[PDB]
Structures are given as C-alpha cells and as structure tokens.
Amino acid sequence: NTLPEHSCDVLIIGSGAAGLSLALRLADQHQVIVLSKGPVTEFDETDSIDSHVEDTLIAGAGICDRHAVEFVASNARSCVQWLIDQGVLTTLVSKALNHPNIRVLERTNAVDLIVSDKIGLPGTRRVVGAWVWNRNKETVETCHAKAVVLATGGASKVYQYTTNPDISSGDGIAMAWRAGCRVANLEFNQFHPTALYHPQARNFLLTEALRGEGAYLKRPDGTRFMPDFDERGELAPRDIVARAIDHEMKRLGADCMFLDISHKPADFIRQHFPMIYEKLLGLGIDLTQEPVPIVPAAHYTCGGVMVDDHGRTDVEGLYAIGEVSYTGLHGANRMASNSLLECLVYGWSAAEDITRRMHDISTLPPWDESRVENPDERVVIQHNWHELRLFMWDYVGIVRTTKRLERALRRITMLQQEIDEYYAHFRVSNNLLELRNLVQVAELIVRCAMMRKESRGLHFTLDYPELLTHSGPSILSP
Amino acid sequence: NTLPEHSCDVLIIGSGAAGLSLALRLADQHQVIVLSKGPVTEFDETDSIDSHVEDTLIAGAGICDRHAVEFVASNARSCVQWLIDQGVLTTLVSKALNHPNIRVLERTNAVDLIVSDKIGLPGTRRVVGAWVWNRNKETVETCHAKAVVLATGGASKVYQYTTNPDISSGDGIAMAWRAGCRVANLEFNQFHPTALYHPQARNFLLTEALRGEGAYLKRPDGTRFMPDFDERGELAPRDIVARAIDHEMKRLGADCMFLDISHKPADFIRQHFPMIYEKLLGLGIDLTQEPVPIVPAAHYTCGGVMVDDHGRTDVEGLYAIGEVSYTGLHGANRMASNSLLECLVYGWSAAEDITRRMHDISTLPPWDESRVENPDERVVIQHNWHELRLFMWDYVGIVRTTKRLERALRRITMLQQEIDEYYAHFRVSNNLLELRNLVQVAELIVRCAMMRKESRGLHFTLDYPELLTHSGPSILSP
C-alpha cells in the first residue's frame, strides 16, 4: 500500500462532450482529473418536447424506457443553453485547459478500477480510484478519487471497419463489467453505410447528401444493386443501405462497393461538394469521373453499462455517461441529436449527484507490473487483435444468423482462453489492453445478440425476421 | 451399385509433367483418363551423376534417403532424353490431346478415392476408381479404374500467399490420407522470398537475378533491412531472405516489403529486364523509378504421400508421383532441378509397375449427393477458407515457435468440428472441397511441425535453433 501518484476529488475517464461538460460543471468547487487517451486537442415550445419524445420512441422501435426519454427531452433546452453560456456556441478542450481546477493527463489508458472490497478495504463495495497506464513514463500509476466517471465512448472498434476509433475501444464498458456492473443492449450497434475504403482514408465519411443529390451505389462490375433490395434505391433508410452493401460484399467476395455521382455535372459537383471533392482529389480520386470505393463502418453503441437518471452504475462511486452507457433512451436504434443530448443531460445530472454526495480517505496498492518480455508473443497479441476484428465483422455484423453467432462465441472463448494461458502478467502495453477489453466487450455483444430471437431496430437476424409480441432490453449480469 | 459414368485402365488425377509423362508412357497399350482441374491448356559423364547426388544430400540437410536420391540421379538422363524424344525439346498437353488412347476430362475435381473394403467388396484392400465432381454437368460421377495415380501437386494453397495455386490445393494428399496412406515431411514447405504483392499480380514473381543485378530490399520507410539479418545482404540464401521479410512484415504490422533497382541505370534496366519492366509498367509500376511491393509466397511441398521406388503408396492400386508425394529425395529442402526429375523418374517407374500388374472387374456405388441448400452458410464456407489461409501464414509460416503451432492446431481443430457439425452432406462445390482438403492437409502440416524439435532446412523454429544429433523424416499414420 503506497502513496498514489495522483489524487483528486473526481476522476473523469474520457474527454469528449460528456467528460469535459461534466469536468467543467464540477471544477469551480472540486479538484478534477481528466484522463485523455492521446493529446487532448486532436426545445423552446412545449409541442416540440413532445414531438422529440415521440420520434425517439418511434426510432427506438418499441423498447425505449419512456421515463429516460422524457428525462432527457425535458432537460435538453437547459443543457444546450449551458453550451451557449460557455461560449461554445463544438469543443470544450480550451475551456477545460483554461481551468485551474481541471488537470488533464494526456496519453493515459485506464487499466482497471480500484474497488474497495477488493483492496481488502471494508464498508459498502465502492470505487476509490483507478490504476492508469501513463504512456509517457511507461508505468502503471495509482489515482485515488472520491468518484470515478466513465465517459469513454462506445465499442465500435470490436469491428474491422469503424468510423471513430479513438472513442471506441470499449475500455469503459470492459472495466465496469470487471468491477461488477450490469451491461445491456450491446447487440444494437449502428453502422454508417458509406465510409471511404482507402489506405489513407483517415476514416473519411461519404455523406448521405451525395445520395440525396443523385449518387448511385455500384457493384465492382459497375451495376446498381439497390433496386434488388428496396424500391427507394439509394434513398432507402440507412440501415437498409448498410444491409444491402454487407450482403453484396459477402455474396461476391468483394472488398468494397462503390459510390458514383459521375453521370452528372461537374461544377454541379464542384458547387455542392467541394470539401469532399478536394479531399478525394488529394487521394487521387476525382468525384467528377470515377466511382468512390466504400464499406460500411461500425459507428455508435446504443447499449452499454446500465445507469439510472443520475448516471450512477450498480457500483457506488462509479458513474457512466454518454455512449459508454445504456440509459434506455435509445432502445433499438439511434435518432439524430440524441447522442449529444444524452452526453449533456447525464453529464448535468451526474455532476449534481456527485456534488451532493462528496467521505475522503486512503492510500492504495500499486499495480503488479509483471515485466515479462517475449517479443514474438508480443507480435501475436497484434495478430489476435486483427483476428477479433475480422471475425466480429463476419459473425456479429450487419446481417446476422444463429449459426454465425455460435461461430463468434466459439472464437471469443478461444481468445479468452489464449489470453489467460499465454499473457498472464505480461507487462502492460496499449495493444495488450485493447485486446483484453475488445475481447471482453465482444463476449458481451454476442451474448446479447444470441439472446434476442427477433429482428428489431439495429439487430437483424435471418432466422427471426419478425418482432416478438413481448420484448425489452437484453441485460447481462457479471 | 450402378454403371460408372467413365471407365478406363488408368485414372491419372492431375496434368503437369508427371501426370502427362505417365499418361503418354502408358497410352499405346492402355486406356488412360486424365483428370484436369481447369482447361488442360492454361547426366552425361559419371562424375556428374555423383555430384548431383552429393549436392542433393547437402541441400537435403542430413535427412535425404540416399537410395531415393541415387534412384533418381541414375534414372535422370534417360527420363530427360524421353522428353527430347517426344519432341518436347515445356508442355506435354498437345501430345496427350493428340493421342487417341488418352481422354482428358476438363473442369474435374476428384472428390474421394473408391477403396474396395469400403464398398463392401472383398479381397485385399485396394483402390478401384474415384468419385469425381464434373463442373460442367454439376454432378458427382463414378470413374472405375484398375490403377489410380495421384499427380496433383503440392499443398501451398493452405497459405495466404502462394506462387502456383492451381497445382497446390492439396486434394491428392488429403484423398490419399482419407484412403489410409501415410504422409511425411509436411513441415518442409519452400517459400519464394519475393512475389509481386498487387491486386492483379497473377502470381508474378520477382527473380533472384534482380538481386544478382543490384536491387535492394526495402522497408516501407525506405531503409535496407538485410544487413540487420545477414552480411550477404540481398544476396543471402533465399530461405534467409524469406525469413527476414517474414520477420519485418510481422514486426512492423506491414502488408509487404519492397524490391528497388531504381538507384541504378535505366536502359541498364531496359536491357536486362524488359519482360519484367513491361509487365510492371502495365500495372502502373516503373521498375525504373520506384520500389516494387513484394511478399514471400508458399511455393513447393517437399513432403507428401509416402511412396517407394515405383510410386506406390501404402494402398494397392494407388500411386502418387511428383510434388504430391514424399519419396525421400528432397529431405529438408529442395535443390533446383530435382522437382522436375522426381516427376519424370517416378512417372517412368510407376508406368513400368502399372504395366506389369495390369485384374479387371465391377460396377460401383454412386455418390450420396445430399443437395442441401443454404446460401448464407455457403458464404461462411468462403470465410472459413480465408481464415485458414491467414492463420496458417501466421502460425505455421516462415518463422515458427511452439506457441504459434499450438495456436494453429487449436484453430484447425475448431474448423474440423465446424465442418462436421454444419456442412454434413451439403452439396459438393469447389469451395467446399477445397476447404475440406485444405483443413485436412493443414492438420498434417502442423502435426509434422510440432513433432520436430530442431531447425533443419525449411523448418525454422525459435524454440529449437539447433540440429538434433539423430534425425529423420516426420511420419504420420492415419
């Protein structure tokens, strides 16, 4: 038991809108530490609320928790105005760096949460800090806190193609499960249908508006495949466009599909889509004369760690806000603008709850730091990382079936057994933490999907094309 | 029990130098059928023999069977002259199509050998024909024969990168094992160090002579990696060049490495390597100003089905000649010109043995032809095919270790269990036959490698860098 290298009132793991809007709400009265994965820098009228709640329930396809929808819709206008009041008419980075009461630890990867009854401390089971890999010093340090907030994003990196990898590794979901938290709805993962497929894409995305402006969707032969799937063709609903692409990609053994607005005027392109035009030009693609290669990419996790109205998890002192959590706002899909309101509304209520509960104590046990060095086994850790991402794409991907899911499970179990057998106490590295957490989250994602015997929202399975009469969320318990 | 769709004296499965030189030696007195996978068209002085035998024993690294080396070296001049006498001063295709006694069945994939004690026939266990998928008629037909010769090539397609895929699917090795034959030395697989890495490479190969003429071997940053592996740099022995590339590719997570003769004169290139120059130009690569992307590719199987001096296997009526067999000529590596002499010398002796043993009979049981149709499961068969090829590349590839081999075994076992559980009596298709045979051969390849506790020739394992004092071939028995 040693003195912890860092200590604060509130430890916030993650730095998007949720974790920085929380950090800024607490900073005038408390000492906040923000954990950043890389460099930290790189509703007016009543009828309207009512509509918002209704459109959310609709795009939730029947399993939203309406008290969580209503909680967010009725706290939305003030959480937005709070944005306007901060001068952030986008980011919160300069505001939090400007605050003397917020400290940002950059290049940090949380390893595991420190939970009292585990450090042979007594009292209610509760979280009292986290062990944190500092990639600058290359060591695991202790960080003691009175409340720890998970604000890390989703788990889309379990999938081969992902739109926002830096906020998608799943570390918060996995840490919260290892600490005893329930998770839910992890089979409801949104895929964007048309991301650039290219070696320097840098996750660029091709907008729906290319389609709203006439672009066609082509097979590698050059023919249009959408009329085989849906009468709206290229303007079918996004989930339907993703499913047709997934289908074709798998049916033909093709690497990608194509998006082409060539057939139509040029300056017509030039005026409407410069920012895309230029970007694609700079990769040697002319939006004016050729098809653009594209694949679907996992984009948003509608499920996650379970939380109540204050962003509290099942484990005292631990909160979880934004994409990393399951509030019951989304149900089986995601309506535009709700991910940002969930971030702002639960950062507000977790702030108020943390503030009214703030009892100090302690010093803590350091990390083990087994320092085992096997350069060749280290290269397998990376092989394992790609393998997980490819098989999830095939076996818990856009289109599912029961025999594909059993294939994912069997592979996730094999990796878990290899991890235990061959990596016990290897020295921490980012690749190793990411694998361990991607495999933990993939197990939760397939167990949720194998549980739901119906197609609803983002869960589409060929063995159960219909809705069940009685449904609800998928809930797992550690 | 039905009349067989085809019937002949000698069934030859495969159509390279071995199977056509055999077919032509037997055709004036017997009725031969040649099974072709696609279109069939697409030593003078004594001191010299003695040297050949010695250089073979040397490149065999200590485990050649010297009676099999000597058998080939002493029958080489006449098997070559036999080539000159056929007017084939390259291919044997027009000569066999010109012979009235040879029939060629094109687009055919042998499924399994028909072995007497299995068709509840009585007498010594012996082969009496094969069930054959005809891709034109889309049906499995029976072919009755008095002797069946396997002449199908090696198993390099178990690996992600392969130089000659049409002669590498492993179907002969797998069929011969299912019929009861022993196999040996399947851990001794030769990899060519510099194949073109490109989407339309069509397996083009970059010659050693580019290196003998000054080309450098580069990392993606552009630096030369060979001085870190060996003092001969780019002229180190081929196996050493392949191992350094494998190493770097895995160490950096890179897709390929590079071959560049740019640094030097142009017409200098133009005169020495036109045929390469032009070919690479036509793919948009100038051998004159840029690096050429390259990966190692599995090229030759030194092991295979066990055979004696006449090309007889352990199962009466069945022969196996050329790359598909293990004669004990090669030992742990392959010396240039011996693969072609093995083909010619054993096609000669199997011909003489078949001719002196030629008793007729029968009619046979048709294939089952379960006609199960599940289009989505069919798409998994292909996923499974890529997965096998990628993991063999990592786990029984150019550089080995004991923990990588245990990872291959565990994956091959999982695929075998999936195949049984999910594909029982699916209808035959080429993809399904290839998977079944690649997985069977991969199991034999890893069991041989896990057996040898030393690095010898083409088997290089980081856990056992030295030679054992007592060694011999790796032998498995069904």
From Swiss-Prot, chains A, B:
Binds 1 FAD per subunit. It holds the Pfam family FAD_binding_2. Succinate binds at residues 192, 207-208, 337. Optimum temperature is 40 degrees Celsius. It catalyses: L-aspartate + O2 = iminosuccinate + H2O2; fumarate + L-aspartate = iminosuccinate + succinate. It comes from Escherichia coli (strain K12). Catalyzes the oxidation of L-aspartate to iminoaspartate, the first step in the de novo biosynthesis of NAD(+). Can use either oxygen or fumarate as electron acceptors, which allows the enzyme to be functional under aerobic and anaerobic conditions. In vivo, fumarate is used under anaerobic conditions, and oxygen is the predominant electron acceptor under aerobic conditions due to the lower fumarate levels. In vitro, fumarate is a more efficient electron acceptor and is kinetically superior to oxygen. Its main location: cytoplasm. Folds into three domains: the FAD-binding domain, the capping domain and the C-terminal helical domain. Signal peptide: none annotated. Disruption phenotype: Mutants lacking this gene generate 25% less H(2)O(2) than the parent strain. Its cofactor is FAD. The lineage of its organism: Bacteria, Pseudomonadati, Pseudomonadota, Gammaproteobacteria, Enterobacterales. This is L-aspartate oxidase.
